[PDB]
């Protein structure tokens, strides 16, 4: 996956968390990044088209990460979009529920750029990107 212009959507209700993820992506060379504050905001942006990767917080108001993921996976236009779930605390039950709903990966925050890079590269490889 050599497309450094792959378009990311970073979804989290905390603006500071979004800025952290955006800055880590920038460090890796991924600058084509937009933000959303909950699952509905995210879906509105995704329908505008052009996105290549979603990084979503697990716990958000109104529409949480699991519901966002399910909605993406059920939509024929975006059903193959990579989705990386982010959580403050790994839980077996959540990991399995996310996998059942089609998550591409799952990672615990706070994470470093190196950890993010590894997550992304393993997802790109798993998905044949
Ligand atoms: Mn949150």
């Amino acid at each position: 996956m050599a497309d450094k212009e792959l378009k990311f959507l970073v979804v989290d209700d905390f603006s500071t968390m979004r800025r952290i993820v955006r800055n880590l992506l920038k460090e890796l060379g991924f600058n084509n990044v937009e933000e959303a504050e909950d699952g509905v905001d995210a879906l509105n942006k995704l329908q505008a088209g052009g996105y290549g990767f979603v990084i979503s917080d697990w716990d958000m108001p109104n529409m949480d990460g699991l519901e966002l993921l399910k909605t993406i996976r059920a939509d024929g236009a975006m059903s193959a979009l990579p989705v990386l779930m982010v959580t403050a605390q790994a839980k077996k039950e959540n990991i399995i529920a996310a996998a059942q709903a089609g998550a591409s990966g799952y990672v615990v925050k706070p994470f470093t750029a190196a950890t993010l890079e590894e997550k992304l590269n393993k997802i790109f490889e798993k998905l044949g990107m």
Side-chain angles (χ1 to χ4, degrees):
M1 215 298 301
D3 183 4
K4 292 303 205 182
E5 298 310 306
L6 189 67
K7 190 175 182 177
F8 288 76
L9 186 63
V10 172
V11 195
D12 197 297
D13 58 308
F14 293 1
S15 182
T16 292
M17 285 301 330
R18 299 196 303 271
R19 299 173 68 146
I20 287 165
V21 176
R22 178 193 279 275
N23 193 91
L24 294 169
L25 285 167
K26 180 188 187 192
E27 176 175 346
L28 300 181
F30 297 115
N31 300 273
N32 193 10
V33 178
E34 303 297 335
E35 294 175 35
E37 70 182 29
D38 70 24
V40 169
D41 190 30
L43 289 164
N44 284 333
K45 289 188 169 56
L46 288 172
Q47 287 190 297
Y51 285 90
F53 206 107
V54 178
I55 300 178
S56 182
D57 176 13
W58 182 250
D59 183 3
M60 300 179 288
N62 306 312
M63 183 183 289
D64 63 22
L66 182 62
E67 182 64 18
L68 170 61
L69 169 62
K70 287 175 181 175
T71 306
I72 290 170
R73 288 280 174 271
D75 186 305
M78 52 183 163
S79 62
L81 262 180
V83 180
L84 171 60
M85 306 310 303
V86 181
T87 184
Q89 182 189 352
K91 296 173 177 173
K92 169 177 177 153
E93 293 83 358
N94 291 352
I95 290 166
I96 290 173
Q100 194 284 330
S104 314
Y106 179 107
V107 68
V108 176
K109 71 164 186 169
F111 50 78
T112 60
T115 292
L116 178 61
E117 177 182 38
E118 191 277 356
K119 293 311 303 183
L120 297 179
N121 283 340
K122 293 299 183 174
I123 289 167
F124 296 149
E125 180 176 49
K126 184 167 62 173
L127 296 180
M129 299 170 66

